[PDB]
Amino acid sequence: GPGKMDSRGEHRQDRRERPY
Amino acid sequence: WKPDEQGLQQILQLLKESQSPDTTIQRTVQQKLEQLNQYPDFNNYLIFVLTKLKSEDEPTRSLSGLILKNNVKAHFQNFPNGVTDFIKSECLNNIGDSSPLIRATVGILITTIASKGELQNWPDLLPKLCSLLDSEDYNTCEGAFGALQKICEDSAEILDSDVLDRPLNIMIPKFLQFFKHSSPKIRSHAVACVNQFIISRTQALMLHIDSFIENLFALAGDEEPEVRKNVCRALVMLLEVRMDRLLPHMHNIVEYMLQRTQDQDENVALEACEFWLTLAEQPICKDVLVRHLPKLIPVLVNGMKYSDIDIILLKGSDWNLRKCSAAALDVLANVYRDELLPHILPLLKELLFHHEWVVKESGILVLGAIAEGCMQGMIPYLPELIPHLIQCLSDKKALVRSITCWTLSRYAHWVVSQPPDTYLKPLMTELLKRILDSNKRVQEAACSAFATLEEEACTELVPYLAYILDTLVFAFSKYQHKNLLILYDAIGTLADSVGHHLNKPEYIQMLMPPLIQKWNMLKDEDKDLFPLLECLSSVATALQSGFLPYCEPVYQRCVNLVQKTLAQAMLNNAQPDQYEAPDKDFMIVALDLLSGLAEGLGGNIEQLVARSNILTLMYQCMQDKMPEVRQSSFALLGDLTKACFQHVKPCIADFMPILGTNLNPEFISVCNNATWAIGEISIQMGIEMQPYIPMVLHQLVEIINRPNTPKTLLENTAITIGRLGYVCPQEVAPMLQQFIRPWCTSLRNIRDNEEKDSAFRGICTMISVNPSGVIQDFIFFCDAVASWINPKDDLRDMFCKILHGFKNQVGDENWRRFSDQFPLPLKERLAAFYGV
């Protein structure tokens, strides 16, 4: 919503453990 | 050349000495070579021992060759041509030496030469190399192919670049003759070569595609693994770029790939398995699989078990059959959606409850893999499966525990949507326990999974906040370094989920000290700052004033990191050959943390900014080539504008033209943040904004009428246009007819807050200045006003003044017919508030 977009959440998703 | 005995004896002596078991002889041999390598003539001796000195044993000849190789990759610029040409000559002349070790050494030399310097500087390498394929001696053609293969691997693009006169128009049509070749090695080289130029859609290959494909099939019957492996990846690549060409053979191809996927040789199977992964991206997937799908699913499912070696290794990680199969299943689930469930549920029943842990673990994986695609179809089964998975969290096998964490996390949406006490509560409870597992893989799996859950739950976590923090804090003292990184991420997302609820003296006191502690350990060049800083960013925003006792050093370090990054970049820009380009992520994370600090503290960041050059640093950031850098800087700009505008005002005249050149929707979040920023500066500028409006308005209007534009960009664009109009109705109100529709469509859907208030004040002022600008599209305005739940009294009066104004303009009759089209809620609302 109205306000700034950041990539923080996305950066955390990239670092998150995944089996594949 | 000029090898003399004295010289040769000395180098051989040194080569013998380098092969000494003695450790001290080694250290002094190192320094002896250290000096000699800088003497180009020395290199002449090195190649001579490799290629000419038959007397010497193989490890001696080859080591000479390898030392030379290192020289050719740290000193090659400083080679004169006379030595270079002697090496080049000597290599190609010995490419097929009957010793495999010599052959390999000669090979690395050729390819390393081509690599490091020879780029185009070796004009006749490729041509001679190609003709060397036609040669008689087996080793000779083998050696030449090996070289070519390697050249294509790191050189791939030799065509697409055209720095040499289109050389690939000769090579590619030359490899496929050797597909036919009697020896397995040569076949492989040939295919492995061609393969390099498929995804690039290489001209030479694309207009030779039939010859390729025909020759590939001719190979299908081959049982040599290396050949199978290469054929397999050919087909995979072809599938991505030449779909047209293989349809007519698709049944036979699928049959072939399905066989190889079941190959007992792990490598064949892995290359084969990629086919399914990329096939699932093509729109023709369903049609092509109809005859084979029933076998494919169980085959994928079976390859998703850990291999026997991995089981052993993981008791005491990169791409493999398991990951490929699981990824393929994931995409197939998204393709087939609920149609996949009858294939997969019978397999799940035999896997999920099995007495062999390896089998069970794969079952849980499958269940997780299919979650996104088959979500709707799985709902009926979740009341049973979820409680079962929760139990599995305390399975005695770590590998079962860890995969359960993940699979549960894949069903987080459903869990959160059910009554909290039935699934969420026990799940959260067992995840927290699992965060403190004694096993390190479990720790991260649990921590990753909890974060995912946090994201989904949001405010739903607030009641359990104290209990949550207890565990997360304790983890600080428990975790080694790798897992602390995932932990910061979990804290970060926690802070985002619970917002201001985090602001309690007890929470701050248990949370802050260990965060700063690791902050003090980490140096400015350590990437492990990224997660810590991103974590701090979220905490700061959530804590607001609570962060006061901590801000100063955090503020200083961030500005500083931005400063030194900018410095390093300039230094690299001046002398690239001596100074390393910086990692701009340090700068992105620092800006983003300054943004959070500014959002959190607001006005209370003034004192720090007063003592700072952050704005002069921002000026360069805003002009950076990297979108994410700009994106972060426009965000900070917007934040400082709100928090302490007095320091920003001086810069506006410089800042605006840059904001104006970054209203490009191609970069969504840059465009967004620029847009937001310019809206916030408007409010601070008042009518002083007038000169800057033209450099920005046309574009904003273009963006708000743009199809396939994200919800958030459109919202910010609408607000900003609203804001510009509020301070300068005269410059923007003429444009009203062109934006009012999407302006209204976008904003009717947003929460009642300060921004919306601000933007609607603007739209009212503009209507007062250009009412014929709304008349034609008044329903949109009506709907947008009706979206207000609790408008401030003055804003309300503006509304009914415009509404009353319009009804009076068209008369009781036209009005009643216009208001006929009102949905009931709308018709009703503008009598509760507006009496229309």
Q: Which residues of B touch A11 (CB under 8 A)?
A: 530, 534
Instruction: For residue B554, count CB atoms less than 10 angstroms from its CB and return exposed for 0-12, middle for 13-18, buried for 19 or more.
Output: buried
Q: In this complex, which of B403, B493, B750 lies closest to A12 when CB atoms are compared?
A: B493
- Spacing of C-alpha B5 from chain mean position: 59
Residue B826: Cβ within 10 Å count: 16
Q: Total structural domains in chain B?
A: 1
What DSSP state is assigned to residue B547?
Answer: G
Q: In this complex, which of B402, B639, B672 lies closest to A5 when CB atoms are compared?
A: B672
Nearest to B333 by CA among B346, B317, B344: B344
3-state secondary structure of B320: coil
* Cβ pair B149, B110 in contact under 8 A: no
Distant-in-sequence, close-in-space partners of B60: CB < 8 Å, separation ≥ 6: B12, B15, B16, B19, B49
Structure tokens at B41: 């003539």
Distance CA B363, CA B427 (A): 20
Mark yes or no for CB contact A20/B719 under 8 Å: no
Structure tokens at B602: 């607001």
Q: Searching chain A, which residue's CA lies closest to the CA of residue B538?
A: A8
Domain CATH for B411? 1.25.10.10
Angle between helices B382-392 and B357-369 (to 10 degrees): 130
* Cβ pair B88, B51 in contact under 8 A: no
Distance CA B816, CA B714 (A): 32
Please identify which residue in the block is written with the tokens 């005269």.
B730
Distance CA B431, CA B199 (A): 43
Q: What angle do CA B263, B269, B275 make, to 5 degrees?
A: 125
Dihedral of CA B334/B335/B339/B344: which sign?
negative
Cα–Cα distance list, B746 to B485, B702, B707, B791 (Å): 38, 15, 13, 18
CB environment B779-806: b (16+ within 10 A), e (fewer): ebbbbbbbbbeebeeebeebbeebbeeb
Q: What angle do CA B106, B108, B113 make, to 5 degrees?
A: 95
B321 shares contact with chain A (CB less than 8 Å):
no
Instruction: For residue B687, count CB atoms less than 10 angstroms from its CB and return exposed for 0-12, middle for 13-18, buried for 19 or more.
Output: exposed
**What is the per-residue DSSP string for B70-115?**
HHTTTSGGG--HHHHHHHHHHHHTTTT-SSHHHHHHHHHHHHHHII
3-state secondary structure of B550: helix
B454 shares contact with chain A (CB less than 8 Å):
no
Cα–Cα distance list, B149 to A6, B107, B145, B190, B420 (Å): 43, 11, 6, 8, 59
Structure tokens at B817: 């017919």
Q: What angle do CA B715, B716, B721 make, to 5 degrees?
A: 100
Distance CA B735, CA B728 (A): 12
3-state secondary structure of B316: coil
B534 shares contact with chain A (CB less than 8 Å):
yes
What DSSP state is assigned to residue B646?
Answer: G
Mark yes or no for CB contact B489/A4 under 8 Å: no
Distant-in-sequence, close-in-space partners of A4: CB < 8 Å, separation ≥ 6: B595, B634, B635, B638, B639, B672, B673, B676
Distance CA B633, CA B621 (A): 6
Nearest to B635 by CA among B703, B570, B589, B584: B589
Question: DSSP H helical segments within B749-792, as ranges?
Answer: 754-769, 778-786
Mark yes or no for CB contact B493/A7 under 8 Å: no
B496 shares contact with chain A (CB less than 8 Å):
yes
B323 shares contact with chain A (CB less than 8 Å):
yes
- B777 phi/psi in degrees, rounded to 5: -120, 35
Distance CA B620, CA B633 (A): 9
* Cβ pair B237, B201 in contact under 8 A: no
Dihedral of CA B707/B713/B718/B723: which sign?
negative
Mark yes or no for CB contact B676/A20 under 8 Å: no
**What is the per-residue DSSP string for B344-404?**
HHHHHHHHTT-SSHHHHHHHHHHHHHTTTTTHHHHGGGHHHHHHHHHHHTT-SSHHHHHHH
CB environment B451-487: b (16+ within 10 A), e (fewer): bbbbbbbeebbeebbeebbebbbebbebbeeebbbbb
Mark yes or no for CB contact A8/B451 under 8 Å: no
Residue B34: Cβ within 10 Å count: 9
Closest Cα in chain B, distance from residue A10 (Å)? 11
Mark yes or no for CB contact A16/B448 under 8 Å: yes
Q: In this complex, which of B406, B669, B756 lies closest to A19 when CB atoms are compared?
A: B406
Q: Which residues of A touch B447 (CB under 8 A)?
A: 17
Q: Which residues of B touch A20 (CB under 8 A)?
A: 322-324, 326-327, 330, 369
Mark yes or no for CB contact B330/A8 under 8 Å: no
A with B: how many residue pairs have Cβ under 8 Å apart? Answer: 90
Distance CA B237, CA B599 (A): 48
CB environment B381-408: b (16+ within 10 A), e (fewer): ebeebbeebbebbebeebbbbbbbbbbb
Distance CA B361, CA B773 (A): 64
Angle between helices B398-409 and B382-392 (to 10 degrees): 140
What DSSP state is assigned to residue B290?
Answer: T
Mark yes or no for CB contact B669/A7 under 8 Å: yes
Domain carrying residue B542: 1-836
**What is the per-residue DSSP string for B3-70?**
--HHHHHHHHHHHHHHT-S-HHHHHHHHHHHHHHTTSHHHHHHHHHHHHT-TTS-HHHHHHHHHHHHH
